[PDB]
């Protein structure tokens, strides 16, 4: 669901561990955005899908024939996957009020409390 890398900051000790990976939880809290509700996102998805089928039928009327049917259905699919991506996969990618960690969990209707296990690098060193 998520995979990230981060550097830390200015310094002079190469092996020193840092907190830079904390940025996967960055989230602006100055002020419930609808985006965090899957029902609203699904509603928008149905609306776009309807508009997509309308585009498909108009373009089929406007539309060698084999090649072109292929093409039109393919553009239709291209548009449906784009809508799916926008409303189900990376709905939070543009939201500064959703952290990448929270959004990765929310893609499947999971909250932060659903993260039950943390596998630690746990190297048995005092700083790490």
């Amino acid at each position: 669901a998520m995979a990230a890398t981060a550097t830390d900051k200015i310094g002079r000790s190469v092996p020193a561990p840092g907190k830079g990976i904390l940025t996967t939880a960055r989230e602006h809290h100055s002020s419930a955005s609808p985006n965090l509700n899957m029902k609203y996102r699904k509603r928008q998805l149905v609306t776009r899908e309807a508009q997509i089928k309308d585009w498909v039928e108009n373009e089929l009327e406007a539309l060698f024939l084999l090649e072109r049917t292929r093409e039109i259905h393919n553009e239709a699919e291209s548009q449906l996957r784009a809508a799916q991506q926008q409303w189900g996969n990376d709905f939070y990618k543009r939201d500064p009020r959703i952290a990448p960690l929270r959004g990765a969990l929310a893609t499947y209707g999971l909250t932060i409390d659903d993260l039950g296990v943390a596998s630690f690098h746990g190297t048995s060193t005092k700083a790490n």
Binding site: I10, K19, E27, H28
Partner: peptide, 17 residues
């Protein structure tokens, strides 16, 4: 020095804006 202090470091990390 970094552009943030050590007291302000986590706040900078956790504020995308």
């Amino acid at each position: 020095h970094a552009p943030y202090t050590d007291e302000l470091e986590e706040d900078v990390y956790l504020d995308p804006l």
